[PDB]
Amino acid sequence: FRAIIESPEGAGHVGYQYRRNTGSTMRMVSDVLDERVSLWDFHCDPSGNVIQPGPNVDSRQYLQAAIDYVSSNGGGTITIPAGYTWYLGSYGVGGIAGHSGIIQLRSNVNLNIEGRIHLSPFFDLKPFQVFVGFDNGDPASSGNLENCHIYGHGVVDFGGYEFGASSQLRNGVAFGRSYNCSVTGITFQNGDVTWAITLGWNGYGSNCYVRKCRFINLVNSSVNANHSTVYVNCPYSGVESCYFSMSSSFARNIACSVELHQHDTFYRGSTVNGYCRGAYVVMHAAEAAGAGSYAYNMQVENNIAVIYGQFVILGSDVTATVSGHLNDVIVSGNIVSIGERAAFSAPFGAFIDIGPDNSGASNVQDIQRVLVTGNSFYAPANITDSAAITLRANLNGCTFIANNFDCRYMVYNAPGTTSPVVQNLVWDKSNVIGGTHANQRAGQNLFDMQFASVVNSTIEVQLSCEDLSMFSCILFPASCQLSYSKITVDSAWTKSMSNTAVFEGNQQAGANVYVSYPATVNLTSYNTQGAVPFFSTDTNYAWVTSAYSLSINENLDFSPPATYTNKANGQLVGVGYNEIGGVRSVSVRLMLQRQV
Amino acid sequence: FRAIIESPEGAGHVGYQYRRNTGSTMRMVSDVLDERVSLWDFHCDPSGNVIQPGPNVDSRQYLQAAIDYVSSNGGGTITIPAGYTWYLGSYGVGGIAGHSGIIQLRSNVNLNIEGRIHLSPFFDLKPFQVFVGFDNGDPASSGNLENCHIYGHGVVDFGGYEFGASSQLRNGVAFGRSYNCSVTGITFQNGDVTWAITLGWNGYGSNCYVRKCRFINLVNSSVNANHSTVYVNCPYSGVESCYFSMSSSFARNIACSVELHQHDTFYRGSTVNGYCRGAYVVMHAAEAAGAGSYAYNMQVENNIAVIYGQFVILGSDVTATVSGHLNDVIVSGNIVSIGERAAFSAPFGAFIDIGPDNSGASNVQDIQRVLVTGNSFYAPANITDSAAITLRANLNGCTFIANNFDCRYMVYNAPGTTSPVVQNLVWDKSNVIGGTHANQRAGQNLFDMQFASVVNSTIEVQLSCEDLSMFSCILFPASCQLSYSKITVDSAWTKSMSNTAVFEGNQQAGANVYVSYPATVNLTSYNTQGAVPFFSTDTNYAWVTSAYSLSINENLDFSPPATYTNKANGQLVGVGYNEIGGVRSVSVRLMLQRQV
Amino acid sequence: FRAIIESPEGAGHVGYQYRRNTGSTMRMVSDVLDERVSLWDFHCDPSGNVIQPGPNVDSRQYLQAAIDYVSSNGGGTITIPAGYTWYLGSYGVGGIAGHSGIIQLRSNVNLNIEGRIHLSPFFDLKPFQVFVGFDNGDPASSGNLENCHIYGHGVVDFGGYEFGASSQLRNGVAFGRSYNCSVTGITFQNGDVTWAITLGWNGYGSNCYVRKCRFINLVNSSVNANHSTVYVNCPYSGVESCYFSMSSSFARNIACSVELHQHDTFYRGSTVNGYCRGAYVVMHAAEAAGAGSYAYNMQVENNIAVIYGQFVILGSDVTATVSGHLNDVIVSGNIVSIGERAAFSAPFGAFIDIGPDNSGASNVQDIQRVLVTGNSFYAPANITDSAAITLRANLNGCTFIANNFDCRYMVYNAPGTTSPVVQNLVWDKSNVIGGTHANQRAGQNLFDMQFASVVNSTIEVQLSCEDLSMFSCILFPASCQLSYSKITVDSAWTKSMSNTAVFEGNQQAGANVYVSYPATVNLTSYNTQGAVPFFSTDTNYAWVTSAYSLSINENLDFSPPATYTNKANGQLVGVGYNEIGGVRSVSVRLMLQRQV
Ligand code: NA
Ligand code: NA
Ligand code: NA
């Protein structure tokens, strides 16, 4: 008896009945204990004696054994105990070997990380992926990870070790071909990694989520070639109520918080600080095997960010056999600011970027039906390289409504460089243009339409304060075609502007071009007493359909025409009134209108 | 001693003190074990021996006993163990009998479902409600369920069995008259049911929530008469960060993801696929006993959906003694699309539907103060039956601002059928009208105002591309009264349209009707040299207050009037200018304005 | 053996091996039990015998001991058992003494409150703070609370006891200088307190959150001087998916649900009922030590509320050495209503309030770059004291876009009282003005611009129904300066209004003032046949740049001018047309325009 009770089967010979209930199951102590399971149950030497965790012990083989055993039982949750730091100090083996895998996740085996997991000095200067859900070296020959949840109040610490080379990959949790998997509550911190979490693989996966997780200082070296904290690469997956922070200078140039790469994915309720970018929202053709070649229903909403580059970078590219498409996106409720910095010191500040592909090609995209609404954007007044939308690649549609944009540019693209084809750009008049950059815009165009062409587009400029420093509210170079488009400049705060709307190739004369903007016109009248016509002295208003006065008449003996039309020769003509006769000569501020 | 230790009281005679702390309580092993509790503690035969779960065992009596026992202790959480499937194979008894109840929930007894719960072939072809919080057959004679939470990573599987008859009801969790109850993390799957979760009962209840739950393939038969995945029927209750998916053809015609039926309820952060409808937002007078006769503070926000019918269906009906009212609703941030399908193959595609009551009556509603803002809606170009708002019943107010609507119709109602009375419909100009359906609108009206009357309403039409296929941007039949309303068509992309705004009963002549729209007018001038009047040849502009040119003057020897007013006889009249005398005859595009 | 097994070390001599796995660690029963920990392990008398909880026992010393012990082990989670009420009946000691502290929180020690915690009659009429994370009397000399999480389905009950005096402070959870701390799932109820949760202290702290918590009846006495349910006073912290309810009359006058006092803080997804206020969003200079003197990235979004005072109260104040600043705020998606009540019976109803400081000073603020968009606001028609924005202090910027405001006033400030300096107030035309208060506005101005000055501001008034009861759509007293501003009144529903826009000091004549509004003008023409001028009989249109007809011409023999300009003497002048000669005299509705 004493032999049995002191042996490992001793709890299995001690009876128990729930709260002495006569109806309850007659069990043994071991049975109630077998309901839960922890790392302590596999953290032992060959002779079954428990090993204590610490900086001089590799917990990898033990945690792996635990995962492998519970995998056999059909599932369950392993606890990684609180009040202990569990150091990992070696590479995993078999299926995860090809992915630099430390621990292999398995279906139905959840990890409750309450304690801390720290990478040992073994992993300094080399690649690693701390948790991997692939069961094969080649991911195309891998099976799925299902129903695997990592959660708790625990920490995952990458040791603070730098990358050994730019080519190396480093990840916290690679769920792999992951269906119904999540990370909740976990702090990932102190490292130099490519991602902290990757969800899915080339579209394979579903219902994967990252929630209430923290991501702190996950870039620290100039070697690090790129970073995206959470990579969503399966559909019906997303990031929610998370926190992302960086302090590293290098992070401001390379780090993005989230990437959405498949349909029905989201990023919301999250706070970001110290990153270059908020989110990539893209279809990479090379990732279209699992969930097809379209990224639709892409949601970036109610996020808070202090970034140094671009907030949302839209993108779409092609392979030889597959073409990427992006459509039905929504960016709403976000309050974003470019952080304090020198002009041109980080990648170009923007709220929306229509970026080219990895290879720098700008003539492969298919971005359309994008709604940008109810967002707040601010950039410090000194930051020249700041824009509401940086439009550097072919755009098939994007709609801006009821946003608040307080930065240097509204619409922008560098002169030279790319020559984007633009369709269906809608800038509703409900977008407010802020005044922080007033007086800073010497020689610059508020909307600098540096494109190959613009069609089926609306730009309704409305100012809410003066900036007479800008060269124009909106400018089109002669190289930019314009047709079936609406371009207006509201007169408010524009009276003293020499240029409002500028069409360098006279593109506002287009048969289906709808424009209105203020201009200053010199008029001469005939000498006739009574009703008398006034004509403009310049002859470049052949495109004008109507014009009306925006200035007072300080004269008593006459009044120029309130409204005007044009003549074959490009003069404006109206009918004023001479109370007394005499040739009149005035300079008046007119709202020039064409088919509007 | 050995007798005691091996018996069921053996753990109660084995001492324990937390981590050998001298200050800790001296307890027995049983006591620490009595803190937690699982299904294993009640899953036994009469002789106390544990029964193993499986497809040939009914776990119902055991789970019920567990719930009944913990209910007596005052509360606690029962675990349904992971790595086991717990098959249910019989009806429950007593209070839940009248509700086809399987398991009876009780106050303060939470169910941690980590394992799987599967319905046995017993329940094929008959009704069931797997969890019921009613304690009585008649729900009006039932007490409350309080502080009852069902959560975990577990699955609830309905077996995939079809309904036996349309009359049958099937539910996953009927919380009943439920206060502080929730379902979190649970996957409900593989079935044919009326609802998966019902919260509250006719307004009785509070603080009930469904979060992070998954709902997969819960309709599979033509017998199934109706489905709504989550039914919210108590105030201060809602659905949050959930996932709803269907593959069944039948689901596209009958299935709705959520219904909000009482005040202060919400649906947000959720993804829907394969449903007919997103949400019903309604006051049913028959459900007004618990929380009164008003549904106010109704929030549908930040959801993603691919549906085949209507996204949000607003509704309000009456009984002999009670009348339903709906007001103070908000629909924001949602990105919805009608899924790929043939025209007219599922219920009419719409973003907002103002539906009639169950009985088809359209003259009982009281829907007002509804805000629809910052949403994205898309329907494939072939889908004729798609609309921003389908307005088929009496409407007392709905406000559209800064939405993106890319579908066949903006405002729509079938000609014939109903004759809705419409008050306070506000379509702000900040709503963008998409171009996907351009060229598809032969013989159709973009805003087809098929109503009995329209009052205190605003329709500010703004196009962002051409569609000359449409018959009109907006049309009112002579049967539709119009008063104290504003109806405008912006000129952008409208130059080549024969009809822009059409008032078939000349309703734009109304004393308090404010309209502006483009039209083509033929004018003849007198021969007088100098200032010379032009008059329209048609005499139907007696309602016009002002008009101005939208076209150029290609002539040199004269210029028609820039602006016009009218005469008693319905002619337009302006003052142009003959440089040389002669009778002039022109056809000009005018913006016709009335009191605007 | 029997001696050992029955003693407290008995579980430590009973062997166990996880599920009889030969690879699993050979442990003792005690070891598996030592993984979890509860209040039962410290809830005993000096002799180690367990004490049962109840209304005649003080659980404070026992819970404290438990917290102190687990603090030593490095961390872990203590459970407060379900099915038991744990009464607290004494003050804590040492570091928390100066804060009226009951229990002292410590780093890494989480409290799983599943049971109920009730304050005993000891605490009636005196102050208390049930949980305190300060370790010192003076908070400036306190260390941090880190990684401390309070969660579960449990209740925290304040006993229902009233305050003994207004000076007393009462709190549920004072996290103190708190980093990575949270309260989740907990119901705080039945009391009279200053706050339920306070996060951070004067800016020190990070990543603190309140989620899924309930707050019910936490004010009940006229003694209670103030209440804010959750006070966020550290950065990167926020409230999410919470519920706040009051029934007390006193709560409607003093209670606010949330306060955001540091940068990157949020309040969203929450429901509020019975409060005076929704949220304070403020920088108090006195709280600028920890996180600096700027509150930026302040997010109030997707909340539901029935309040009786102000929804969001913006604020900013100064000390002798520090000045507060507030900027980059966003208020979106909220649906708020003033609850049913008598006019002037609670603090002034408003959606946004720009309040003065505590000391009533209105000339210290620095509020700018605030976006208010996509919100719904309603106030019962009888409530005179209701406004979209109550602007009672100096404002440096606030932008309103695409909101739905259905209340008595749009912009308001009491005449007399304060004289706010206003810059950058942008009221976009996409804001809808509701009609619930139509006919109630006798002698009142819809926008009552009672300010010292207004500059760089936009007010685009758009009505959607008639209200001829109002004195004006917008009024500026002669004391209010106006410059570099845009003020427009759309003509829709305004035809029968005697006053539309009123400038009592003729401020619309300002050189950079851009206005348009309807007015009624009397005109007389000369007798000349043919083209003939009409002049206004009044001479106060010297500021007018253009004007156009808003009324029909019922005459046949002549037509007045469609458009007009002005003369040096302040007359309007246009060119009409006399078909037959004769002096004409008409009264016409004109849209008066200035530089627009
Ligand atoms: Na070109
Ligand atoms: Na009718
Ligand atoms: Na003044």
Side-chain angles (χ1 to χ4, degrees), chain A residues 38 241 268 491 493 549 579, chain C residues 35 240 268 484 526 546 595:
Chain A
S38 82
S241 289
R268 75 177 290 205
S491 74
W493 295 273
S549 176
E579 169 68 306
Chain C
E35 297 184 341
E240 207 167 43
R268 75 177 290 205
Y484 287 85
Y526 293 162
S546 315
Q595 304 186 111

Side-chain angles (χ1 to χ4, degrees), chain A residues 1 4-5 13-29 31-33 35 73-77 82 84 108 110 147 149 151 179-180 182 206-207 209 211-212 236 240 264-266 268 296-299 301-302 328-330 332 369-371 373 399-402 424 426 428 430 456-458 460 483-486 511-512 514 526 528 531-533 535 542-547 563-569 571 573-575 593-596, chain B residues 1-2 5-12 14 19 29-31 33-44 47-50 69-70 73 81-83 114 116 153 155 187 212 214 216 241 243 268-273 301-306 333-337 374-376 378 402-404 406 429-432 436 462-466 490-496 531 548-556 558-563 575-577 579 591:
Chain A
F1 181 57
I4 302 308
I5 293 293
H13 295 83
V14 180
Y16 171 79
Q17 199 173 42
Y18 180 64
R19 298 181 178 251
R20 300 157 293 274
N21 180 39
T22 63
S24 276
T25 310
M26 289 167 46
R27 312 169 68 184
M28 300 286 151
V29 169
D31 299 332
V32 185
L33 299 187
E35 297 184 341
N73 286 28
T77 308
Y84 294 101
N108 303 294
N110 303 316
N147 311 339
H149 302 270
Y151 71 94
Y179 299 76
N180 197 44
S182 72
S206 258
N207 303 153
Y209 309 94
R211 306 186 180 107
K212 303 172 206 65
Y236 310 110
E240 207 167 43
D264 303 80
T265 57
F266 60 85
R268 75 177 290 205
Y296 54 96
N297 284 348
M298 316 295 281
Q299 200 184 45
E301 284 189 327
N302 305 319
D328 311 311
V329 175
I330 186 161
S332 180
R369 303 198 295 277
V370 177
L371 180 58
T373 191
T399 309
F400 291 83
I401 328 173
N424 308 302
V426 179
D428 193 80
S430 67
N456 285 329
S457 293
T458 301
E460 301 182 295
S483 62
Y484 287 85
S485 293
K486 186 189 197 202
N512 295 91
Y514 297 78
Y526 293 162
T528 312
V532 75
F535 309 87
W543 62 267
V544 181
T545 58
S546 315
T563 60
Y564 304 77
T565 185
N566 69 344
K567 293 168 54 171
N569 69 10
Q571 283 185 290
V573 60
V575 171
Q593 304 186 120
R594 169 166 178 74
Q595 304 186 111
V596 297
Chain B
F1 181 57
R2 182 166 192 193
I5 294 293
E6 281 184 285
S7 88
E9 291 148 39
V14 180
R19 298 181 178 251
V29 169
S30 61
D31 299 332
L33 299 187
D34 291 324
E35 297 184 341
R36 59 80 266 166
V37 55
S38 82
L39 191 50
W40 288 124
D41 294 296
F42 294 80
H43 203 271
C44 55
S47 305
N49 290 298
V50 75
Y69 185 88
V70 181
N73 286 28
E114 285 291 296
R116 312 171 62 81
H153 304 104
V155 177
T187 292
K212 303 172 206 65
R214 298 198 302 153
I216 305 184
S241 289
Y243 172 81
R268 75 177 290 205
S270 305
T271 303
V272 176
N273 192 34
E301 284 189 327
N302 305 319
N303 293 299
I304 309 179
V306 179
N334 306 284
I335 171 159
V336 184
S337 307
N375 307 285
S376 257
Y378 166 78
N403 304 281
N404 189 24
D406 196 354
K429 202 184 204 200
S430 67
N431 294 295
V432 176
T436 306
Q462 175 68 79
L463 299 180
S464 36
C465 74
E466 204 170 59
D490 188 276
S491 74
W493 295 273
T494 76
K495 76 173 287 185
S496 301
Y548 68 95
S549 176
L550 296 183
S551 47
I552 63 174
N553 181 42
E554 85 285 8
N555 299 289
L556 188 71
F558 74 99
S559 54
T563 60
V575 171
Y577 185 78
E579 169 68 306
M591 178 61 82

